[PDB]
């Protein structure tokens, strides 16, 4: 009798966002920038042999 079981799983994520707003003038001014990111990764693999 022979038995073999192999299962691998890998999960990776990433999230980054840069928000920069600058406005220079004699009169009142406003500058707004919004950036957001998100990454999700899921991997699963299973093997069974008997």
């Amino acid at each position: 009798a022979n038995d073999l079981l192999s299962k691998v799983k890998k999960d990776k994520s990433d999230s980054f966002g840069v928000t920069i707003g600058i406005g220079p003038a004699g009169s009142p001014l406003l500058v707004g920038v919004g950036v957001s990111h998100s990454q999700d990764t899921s991997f699963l693999n299973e093997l069974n042999k008997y």
Partner: protein
């Protein structure tokens, strides 16, 4: 304003199983004399007597 993030994950799983079984039996009989019905009864390989 600057915002940055990083994430990482890994999983590893390995399983192994082995099973081996063996058994044998042998029998040798040598009878000389009176090859009648009774010795054929005694010639039964399964029962020892």
């Amino acid at each position: 304003g600057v915002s940055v993030g990083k994430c990482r994950g890994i999983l590893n799983e390995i399983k192994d199983r082995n099973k081996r079984d063996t058994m044998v039996e042998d029998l040798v009989v040598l009878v000389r004399g009176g090859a009648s019905e009774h010795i054929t009864t005694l010639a039964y390989q399964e029962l020892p007597t």
